[PDB]
Design a protein. Sequence first.
Length: 103
Amino acid sequence: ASVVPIRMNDLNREETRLKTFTDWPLDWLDKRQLAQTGMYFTHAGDKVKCFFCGVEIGSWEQEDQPVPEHQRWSPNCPLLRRRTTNNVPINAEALDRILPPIS
Ligand SMILES: [Zn+2]
């Protein structure tokens, strides 16, 4: 993935993030786990935007993955970085699993 340089929506909620994803073009890139890893769909092309670090990201290659992309381009992301956020995750255990360790 390349990066795009620099109701009411509670886009801190994963459910709602997930809402944004109903006109989402890329059927092989799993919007669910995109929307769980911080991102909401801007609607423009294939470009998503992270609520927590403001990273933007489009041009998804057919073997890319959501977290590693998210990490590559903005690795100091509060959410990825397992800082305190206001994220409200559908399934807290699901989030934990799919976030970079720190073993
Ligand atoms: Zn982020």
